[PDB]
Design a protein around this ligand. Structure first.
Ligand code: CLA
Ligand code: CLA
Ligand code: CLA
Ligand code: CLA
Ligand code: CLA
Ligand code: CLA
Ligand code: CLA
Ligand SMILES: CCCCCCCCCCCCCCCC(=O)OC[C@H](COP(=O)(O)OC[C@@H](O)CO)OC(=O)CCCCCCCCCCCCCCC
Ligand SMILES: CC1=C(/C=C/C(C)=C/C=C/C(C)=C/C=C/C=C(C)/C=C/C=C(C)/C=C/C2=C(C)CCCC2(C)C)C(C)(C)CCC1
Ligand SMILES: CC1=C(/C=C/C(C)=C\C=C\C(C)=C\C=C\C=C(C)\C=C\C=C(C)\C=C\C2=C(C)CCCC2(C)C)C(C)(C)CCC1
Ligand SMILES: CC1=C(C/C=C(\C)CCC[C@H](C)CCC[C@H](C)CCCC(C)C)C(=O)c2ccccc2C1=O
Ligand code: SF4
Ligand code: SF4
Lengths: 139, 31, 740, 154, 43, 80, 134, 60
């Protein structure tokens, strides 16, 4: 909290709420917007402010979006990492990169929901990191 | 002594460039 | 010996080659060992000359590729009129073209973007349009939506026919090389049928449909009261009431009593007072005169009946004392190389497109176009830019002819060989002209810009001071104002009120008035000449020196597209014909950008503005052009800083997208500077370190990643530099003029 | 009719080309008999005639277009301003002369060796004459223009 | 043949266009029903 | 002027000599049992420095380098 | 030095003041036929049936021309260096054998027995007057 | 004021006739490749232009 008030009681917020300019086709989209934003904290200007402190009182701001991202993003990286590794054993690696082998990819895309488990498994004992001595380097 | 500005300003704009570029042009072109 | 020669089923129609890429080339067909293969795939897709050497295979691809291109244009053109049918206010716009703004685009009620569909007018919520399609349809005599709905389906049908043609030709029925080489037959057909008959046909539509219907519409009748076009043809009583020349019929035509058609084949040469635009009868008489000239002109060449000219004989017999063998060998170059034909067609087509933009603003040829300053400004600006790009493309393919298709045996002591053998004198003098103009075109601004800051307005190059008047143009102006009477006697009013004459006012607006030329126009016209000469120097140099130079004797062997030819000899950076085109585009953009700026401020200051009943014309910017356009700070202040107020303040209103595209355009311009200033060497070493992190975590790509090629980094930059530049003034021109 | 453009001399290997502007009868006389190429003159007389032509030329721009052009001392400013420009022109010759200038070139229009500008002495004597004739040409143009009303008034 | 058509769809652009349009349509369609979503409302 | 130095990784492909615009490089017999040909750079004074020799070398890294140095009329490619 | 000039009208691209003052070059070749060949600096020129001779401002023009001559199956091209005092020196095929082909009489020059990785660092060699590439 | 047009008259036809004859005499000698099958159809067409050019041109 710094130079702010609750959004529900702030006058400048209520001033903007009367003229909300509904976004979607729904007529009440404007009033429905300002209703939910009353929970957040607002400043003198009348717009809401988010606090990414990490306090559980206000976690929907950044913390819940933060967790939802990393589960989605690690899905993409684990899938890409596994699809790239599976191709390397095959003969024609470069063509499969451009012309995707969907038979190999979609089973991998079916997985990835449990990417944190496989990540920890490779970290504890496996292939998450190659040795520095066996990687190309400049002089 | 405001008259000094009338004598020292153009010396910086005309006399100094002419003398310096004259010697340097001969110095760089010497053999 | 014109003949239809065709090969039956050369190329199959399998989907096999779709899957495997790089089929067209052998080097790419091997495999994608590297990411540069991806970029090279697109850069070599249309390089048919690199795929094969047989001109039959090249021409068949080109002739069929054109058909697929036409389908794209027809789908586009059919798409525009379709939007006018379903989502538009055109039917309401005809009821009041002066109070309702034109709109045909509607964006859906999704996140925050319903604002763009503001109250454009006529109970319709849509984006305001500046292409001017509404004025064209009125010139076409279209008064209802169902009529437009029919034309759109016809274009889509026509699109499939063109699409069917390219399939039928490349695969099933491929012409041989002889079919394309009969130039004398091609030129007769295009001049007579495509241009002559097409012009003659449009005269029929104007005479029967547009001219009568528009003559009822400007009178004041309701849109519903107007009969349909077929009603005019069947019922001649309605046609005779407006144009009584039709009562005589077609007999005055055959009997050479052509004066009976004077009612609807006039030569007034002025603008219609009611609707700002040329007279439909004058336009009706236009195409009829054009068709006869084109139909007659196309019979010049032989085309296999012994009667006509051989172009080879015309060119060879035009030798002279100064030119050794004259135009000998040019016919062979133009009949054995597609790039030479492409260079000539592009260059003069681009100059044509610029020439259109100047005619249209002074001679508005559509109804109510002049009063719509937004349509008029973007229309001029549009074709001005497209012509600039096409001219630069002409120089590129002109140079590509040299490296690829030049035959020294043919070009021996001819007009071209003689040009290359004194190329130093051509460029050295053009170099002198470019310096002379840049000093005496821009230096006069600095002298004014410097003097006004020193409090010496008497020492400037201004209308009260030393003024350099454009006497030559003012003389040519008076000859046009006096063409009514004397020379061109039958003309009642001059070809345009821009040259001079009385003012024309439609509603509260001004369609056109005399454009007075003073000291400011004398300077800017020289600025244009300065900037035009320099891009010619950049482009012309690439053409002559593409084969060889004093620095590089063997430049053709390296090709048209090579980065440097080494770092020695000082530095050979950007020595190819390609890099000249890369540099010329910035100067093309520099030159062309002042033209539209010269147009915007002059027309707003001197021409356009509200007009009173007493003739008092309250111009938009208040005549500030004369005393402010002489200094650079005046443009920065009065043009850029002032007129951009509508753009930045567009937030929270219907024009908010222009403020966004305006601001976003500056980004892409600056993002261009990554690739122009930098070099491939730094970026490959950066990717090296990033590849290590992937080799660490075993995310290493099989396709080894490499930085972009050198010529690509230059190409990628100029693409951004121009896109980010043009989009900026695009939004500034739009948001400013649309508010005012 | 037959060709008008020929190679410089008999050799086509060399760069220059014989053209009307380069090798006409009229142009060859004018250029070769200009003081910079005229035969039978000393280096001093060449610089005098050249300067006398230039002082008369340079007086005009300063007077009728420089500052104080619309004043009583307009013509006087042209004389002093021109002399200051002639002195810089004179100084430039002394530097180009006192820096061991390489050579003078021979082109088609001036086929023979042009003159004895092949040494420091020829250029230095040229410079001394430029100042003498250069100042003279400006002084002449001043007295005529200032007293042109009288000369017509006669 | 159909085997050749599948390879064309599996290439980089067509696979990217098909996938990105699907991810785009989801965010697009979700945003018309659930309008704003500045944060997660916490009970 | 521009020094052209050759190293022991040569294999006698001769692709460097064919690329030289000014004929600076000349193959010479390797007395050892490697091959009957190894490159040389006798007329180094005419080295303009366009690095065409390096682009044509098939080694991992070059068997022949071109270390730039002092400039001359022959090196700067001046016909005047 | 003997030969005939290729027949062409002339060209600005060609010999300049440098030839009189320092080191003009020349190229000689003999062809059985009389074809048309592009010159080093712009233009096109015919060639006589015996002992063609052309003067060129640099050495690069000649070898660039010689490569074009090889397209016409002409392999006897000799380049000279003519000084202002008239001194001529036979240069390009310095021996009877071309450079790409090996000849026993030649000796290796500017050869380093080591690989590039084995060269010393610059800090090891500073103020001595020697370079790392030695 | 529109230019004066021409009512039909038999005198007009003689100009079209004579215009064709001069064309036939002009082409028969100077045409490089007169026969290929034609030229009679073509030379008569040019006479109509010259005729229409003279016919309308005379009366102004
Ligand atoms: C930094 C030093 C400097 C100084 C002190 C000056 C001073 C001057 N400049 Mg100047 N100038 C400079 C730098 C400088 N400049 C640079 C760097 C540029 C390049 C942009 C210019 C470009 C420039 C232009 C383009 C012009 C001037 C002019 C002038 C004069 C205007 C005076 C006036 O009110 O009207 C004039 C008032 C008068 C009473 C008449 C002036 C008479 C002159 C100055 C007499 C000079 C005598 C001369 C030195 C004789 C020498 C002979 C001897 C060697 C034997 C003034 C003498 C203007 C001018 O016309 O001067 C003649 C002019 O047009 N300057
Ligand atoms: C056919 C051409 C021609 C012309 C235009 C003239 C014109 C003139 N002659 Mg003349 N003359 C001619 C042929 C000509 N002459 C021939 C063929 C002969 C031989 C018989 C003469 C013999 C002759 C004599 C004997 C005299 C003249 C004089 C004059 C001037 C008297 C004007 C006057 O009324 O009092 C004077 C009015 C004035 C306004 C003062 C005039 C001041 C002079 C002309 C200024 C000249 C400056 C001059 C251009 C400088 C030359 C340098 C330049 C080349 C760079 C007048 C300018 C008389 C004279 O004394 O003139 C000065 C005089 O005594 N003439
Ligand atoms: C009816 C279906 C059909 C089929 C199966 C084929 C099959 C074939 N054609 Mg063919 N062709 C067709 C229709 C067809 N064509 C039509 C209708 C035309 C006339 C335009 C042509 C014209 C044509 C030419 C001129 C050539 C071929 C070639 C080929 C062969 C290689 C094509 C390839 O792999 O590239 C597959 C490429 C694509 C699928 C991309 C095509 C993109 C389209 C045409 C344009 C899209 C424009 C779009 C609006 C731009 C938007 C940009 C922006 C939004 C991002 C292959 C046998 C080539 C050949 O034989 O090589 C030797 C060749 O040179 N065809
Ligand atoms: C009639 C018009 C026309 C035609 C038929 C051609 C045809 C050709 N040109 Mg060409 N050219 C033209 C106009 C034309 N050009 C113009 C106007 C210019 C000046 C800009 C050039 C400049 C030019 C150069 C510099 C080169 C060619 C080359 C070529 C050849 C190969 C090009 C290729 O592989 O295509 C494929 C091309 C690409 C994939 C590049 C894509 C560029 C995109 C479209 C730019 C983005 C613009 C877009 C509107 C931005 C907004 C949308 C975006 C944000 C999504 C081919 C024969 C090349 C060649 O080697 O010829 C032998 C070559 O080096 N041209
Ligand atoms: C504002 C930036 C700028 C400026 C001023 C220039 C200037 C020039 N460019 Mg250019 N150029 C630029 C940006 C710029 N460029 C960019 C960004 C690119 C990349 C696309 C290029 C690419 C480019 C090419 C490819 C070519 C040029 C060429 C030219 C020259 C044209 C000749 C001319 O106008 O006379 C000179 C005019 C000026 C210098 C204008 C200002 C001069 C003022 C009025 C005079 C100064 C007053 C006074 C004397 C100062 C004295 C001060 C004293 C104290 C020393 C000129 C030197 C062409 C060329 O060289 O052909 C001859 C050419 O081929 N340029
Ligand atoms: C490059 C364009 C340009 C031009 C045309 C001018 C013109 C002028 N300036 Mg100016 N100025 C410029 C750029 C320019 N300026 C810039 C860039 C700056 C900023 C530094 C200034 C700053 C400036 C100041 C501060 C002042 C001027 C002044 C002046 C005026 C006096 C000129 C003078 O005395 O020079 C004298 C010129 C000469 C002695 C040389 C003239 C060369 C001639 C014309 C050559 C002709 C060649 C011929 C046709 C070919 C021969 C062919 C043969 C075969 C026969 C004049 C109107 C003065 C003024 O008061 O303005 C009213 C003044 O005080 N200027
Ligand atoms: C006896 C010969 C003769 C005469 C007196 C005329 C007289 C005229 N012709 Mg005409 N004409 C002629 C033969 C002749 N023609 C022939 C043989 C042709 C065919 C090539 C033409 C084709 C022709 C055209 C195409 C035009 C004229 C025009 C004109 C008018 C004058 C235009 C102008 O600027 O002046 C004038 C009435 C112009 C005219 O009448 O405009 C109203 C016009 O546009 N003429
Ligand atoms: C001078 C006009 C050209 C007069 C002209 O071209 O003369 C044309 C003249 C005619 O020679 P021919 O009779 O051999 O040409 C016969 C033709 O059929 C062959 O194309 O040739 C020359 O003298 C060559 C000079 C070219 C170089 C002249 C300078 C060009 C300056 C650049 C253009 C300036 C344009 C300014 C106006 C916009
Ligand atoms: C037609 C023609 C032309 C023209 C010409 C001209 C334009 C001329 C120039 C002019 C000039 C540019 C002139 C000048 C002159 C000058 C003079 C006239 C001078 C004077 C001088 C004096 C007289 C001086 C003396 C003195 C001295 C020296 C010292 C002391 C003082 C005194 C003063 C005594 C030309 C050739 C281009 C080309 C061809 C044709
Ligand atoms: C004829 C001829 C030619 C040509 C030329 C031309 C065409 C042009 C030139 C140009 C030039 C070459 C120019 C110049 C100019 C300059 C100026 C523009 C200057 C000015 C100055 C001033 C203004 C200053 C003043 C002053 C002084 C001087 C001192 C004191 C101070 C003062 C500042 C006052 C040639 C070369 C080829 C050759 C020979 C003959
Ligand atoms: C930045 C820069 C680069 C590096 C630029 C690069 C490598 C551009 C890379 C473009 C994209 C990002 C490549 C990867 C695209 C992905 C395969 C797409 C992923 C798929 C999803 C988007 C669907 C150069 O190579 C260069 C060369 C010469 C002069 C200047 C420069 C220069 O400025
Ligand atoms: S740097 Fe150039 S000229 Fe020198 S040896 Fe290498 S390729 Fe030949
Ligand atoms: S390794 Fe390089 S320098 Fe050695 S022979 Fe091969 S191409 Fe020539």
């Amino acid at each position: 909290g710094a130079d702010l008030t609750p959004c529900a009681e702030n006058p400048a917020f209520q001033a903007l709420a009367k003229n909300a300019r509904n976004t979607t086709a729904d007529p009440q989209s404007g009033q429905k917007r300002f209703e939910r934003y009353s929970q957040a904290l607002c400043g003198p200007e009348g717009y809401p402010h988010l606090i990414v402190d990490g306090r559980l009182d206000r976690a929907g701001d950044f913390l819940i979006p933060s967790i939802l991202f990393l589960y989605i993003a690690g899905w993409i990286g684990w899938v890409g990492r596994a699809y790239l590794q599976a191709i390397k054993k095959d003969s024609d690696t470069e063509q499969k990169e451009i012309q995707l082998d969907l038979g190999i990819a979609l089973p991998i895309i079916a997985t990835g929901f449990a990417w944190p488990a496989a990540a920890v498994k490779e970290l504890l004992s496996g292939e998450l990191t190659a040795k520095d001595s066996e990687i190309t380097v400049s002089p | 002594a405001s008259f000094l500005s009338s004598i020292f300003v153009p010396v910086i704009g005309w006399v100094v460039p002419i003398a310096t570029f004259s010697f340097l042009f001969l110095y760089i072109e010497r053999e | 010996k014109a003949r239809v020669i065709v090969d039956k089923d050369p190329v199959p129609t399998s989907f096999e080659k779709w899957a495997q890429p790089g089929h067209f080339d052998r080097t790419l067909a091997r495999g994608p060992k590297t990411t540069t293969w991806i970029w090279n795939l697109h850069a070599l897709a249309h390089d048919f000359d690199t795929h094969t050497s047989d001109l039959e295979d090249i021409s068949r691809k080109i002739f069929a590729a054109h058909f697929g291109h036409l389908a794209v244009v027809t789908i586009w053109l059919s798409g525009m009129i379709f939007h006018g049918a379903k989502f538009s206010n055109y039917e309401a716009w005809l009821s009041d073209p002066l109070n309702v703004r034109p709109s045909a685009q509607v964006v859906w009620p999704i996140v925050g973007q319903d604002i763009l569909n503001g109250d454009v007018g006529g109970g319709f919520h849509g984006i305001q349009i500046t292409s001017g399609l509404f004025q064209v349809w009125r010139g076409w005599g279209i008064t209802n939506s169902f009529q437009l709905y029919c034309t759109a389906i016809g274009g889509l049908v026509l699109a499939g026919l063109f699409l069917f043609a390219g399939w039928f030709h490349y695969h099933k029925r491929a012409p041989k090389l002889e079919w394309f080489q009969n130039v004398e037959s091609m030129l007769n057909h295009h001049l007579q049928v495509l241009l002559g008959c097409g012009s003659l046909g449009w005269a029929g539509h104007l005479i029967h449909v547009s001219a009568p219907i528009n003559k009822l519409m400007d009178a004041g009748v309701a849109v519903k009261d107007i009969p349909l076009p077929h009603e005019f043809i069947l019922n001649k009583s309605l046609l005779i009431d407006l144009f009584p020349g039709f009562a005589a019929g077609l007999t005055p035509f055959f009997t050479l009593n052509w004066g009976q058609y004077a009612d609807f084949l006039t030569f007034k040469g002025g603008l219609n007072p009611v609707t700002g635009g040329l007279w439909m009868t004058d336009i009706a008489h236009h195409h009829l005169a054009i068709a006869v000239v084109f139909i007659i002109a196309g019979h010049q060449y032989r085309t296999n009946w012994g009667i006509g000219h051989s172009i080879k004989e015309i060119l060879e017999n035009h030798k002279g004392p100064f030119t050794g063998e004259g135009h000998k060998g040019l016919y062979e170059n133009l009949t054995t190389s597609w790039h030479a034909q492409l260079a000539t067609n592009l260059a003069f087509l681009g100059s044509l497109t610029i020439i259109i933009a100047h005619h249209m603003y002074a001679m508005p040829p559509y109804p109510y176009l002049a009063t719509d300053y937004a349509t008029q400004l973007c229309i001029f600006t549009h074709h001005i830019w497209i012509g600039g790009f096409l001219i630069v493309g002409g120089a590129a393919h002109a140079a590509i002819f040299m490296v690829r298709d030049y035959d020294p045996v043919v070009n021996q002591n001819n007009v071209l060989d003689r040009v290359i053998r004194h190329r130093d004198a051509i460029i050295s003098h053009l170099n002198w002209v470019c310096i002379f103009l840049g000093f005496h075109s821009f230096g006069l601004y600095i002298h004014n810009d410097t003097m006004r800051a020193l409090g010496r307005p008497q020492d400037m190059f201004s209308d009260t001071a030393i003024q350099l008047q454009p006497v030559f143009a003012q003389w040519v102006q008076n000859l046009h104002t006096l063409a009514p009477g004397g020379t061109a006697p039958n003309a009642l009013e001059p070809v345009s009120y821009a040259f001079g004459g009385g003012v024309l006012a439609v509603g509260g607006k001004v369609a056109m008035m005399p454009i007075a030329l003073g000291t400011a126009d004398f300077l800017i016209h020289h600025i244009h000449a300065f900037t035009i000469h320099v891009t010619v120097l950049i482009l012309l140099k690439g053409v002559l020196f593409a084969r060889s130079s004093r620095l590089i004797p063997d430049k053709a062997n390296l090709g048209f597209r090579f980065p440097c030819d080494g770092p020695g000899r000082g530095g050979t950076c950007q020595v190819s014909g390609w890099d000249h085109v890369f540099l010329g585009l910035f100067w093309m953009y520099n030159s062309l950008s002042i033209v539209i700026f010269h147009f915007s401020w002059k027309m707003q200051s001197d021409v356009w503005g509200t007009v009173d009943a007493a003739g008092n014309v309250s111009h938009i910017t208040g005549g500030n052009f004369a005393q402010s356009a002489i200094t650079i700070n005046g443009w920065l202040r009065d043009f850029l800083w002032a007129q951009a107020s509508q753009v930045i303040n567009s937030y929270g209103s219907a024009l908010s997208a222009y403020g966004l595209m305006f601001l976003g355009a500056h980004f892409v311009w600056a993002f261009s500077l990554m690739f122009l200033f930098s070099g491939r060497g730094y970026w490959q070493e950066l990717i090296e370190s990033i590849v290590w992190a992937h080799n660490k975590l075993k995310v290493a790509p099989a396709i080894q990643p490499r930085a972009l090629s050198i010529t690509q980094g230059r190409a990628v930059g100029v693409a951004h530099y121009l896109l980010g530049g043009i989009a900026t003034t695009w939004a500034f021109f739009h948001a400013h003029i649309l508010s005012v | 009719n037959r060709e008008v453009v020929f190679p410089a001399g008999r050799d086509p290997q060399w760069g220059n080309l014989e053209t009307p502007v380069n090798a006409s009868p009229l142009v060859k006389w004018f250029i070769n008999n200009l003081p910079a190429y005229r035969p039978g003159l000393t280096p001093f007389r060449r610089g005098l005639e050249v300067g006398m032509a230039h002082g008369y030329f340079l007086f005009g721009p300063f007077a009728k277009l420089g500052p104080l052009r619309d004043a009583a001392n307009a013509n006087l400013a042209g004389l002093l301003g021109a002399i200051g420009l002639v002195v810089l022109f004179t100084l430039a010759l002394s530097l180009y002369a006192n820096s061991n200038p390489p050579t003078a070139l021979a082109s088609v229009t001036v086929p023979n060796p042009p003159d004895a500008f092949q040494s420091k002495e020829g250029w230095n004597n040229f410079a001394s004459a430029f100042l003498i004739g250069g100042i003279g040409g400006a002084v002449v143009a001043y007295f005529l223009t200032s007293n042109l009303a009288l000369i017509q008034g006669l | 043949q159909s085997s050749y058509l599948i390879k064309f769809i599996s290439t980089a652009p067509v696979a990217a266009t098909i996938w990105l349009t699907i991810t785009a349509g989801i965010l697009i369609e979700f945003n018309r029903f659930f309008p704003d979503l500045l944060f997660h409302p916490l009970p | 002027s521009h020094t052209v130095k050759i190293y022991d990784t040569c294999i006698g492909c001769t692709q460097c000599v064919r690329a030289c615009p000014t004929d600076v490089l000349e193959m010479v017999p390797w007395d050892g049992c490697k091959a009957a040909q190894v490159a040389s750079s006798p007329r180094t004074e005419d080295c303009v420095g366009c690095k065409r020799c390096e682009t044509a070398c098939p080694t991992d890294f070059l068997s022949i380098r071109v270390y730039l140095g002092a400039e001359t009329t022959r090196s700067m490619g001046l016909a005047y | 030095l003997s030969g005939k000039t290729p027949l062409f009208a002339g060209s600005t691209g060609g010999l300049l003041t440098k030839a009189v003052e320092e080191e003009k070059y020349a190229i000689t070749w003999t062809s059985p036929k009389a074809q048309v060949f592009e010159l080093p600096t712009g233009g096109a020129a015919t060639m006589h049936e015996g002992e063609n001779l052309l003067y060129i401002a640099r050495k690069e023009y000649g070898i660039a021309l010689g490569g074009q001559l090889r397209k016409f199956k002409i392999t006897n091209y000799k380049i000279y260096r003519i000084l202002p005092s008239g001194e001529t020196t036979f240069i390009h095929p310095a021996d009877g054998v071309f450079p790409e082909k090996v000849n026993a009489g030649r000796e290796k020059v500017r050869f380093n027995a080591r690989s590039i990785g084995e060269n010393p660092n610059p800090s090891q060699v500073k103020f001595s007057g020697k370079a790392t590439y030695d | 004021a529109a230019t004066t047009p021409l009512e039909w008259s038999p005198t007009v036809g003689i100009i079209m006739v004579i215009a064709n004859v001069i064309a036939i005499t002009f082409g028969r000698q100077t045409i490089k490749y007169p026969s290929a099958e034609p030229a009679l159809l073509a030379t008569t067409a040019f006479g109509h232009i010259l005729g229409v050019g003279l016919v309308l041109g005379l009366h102004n």
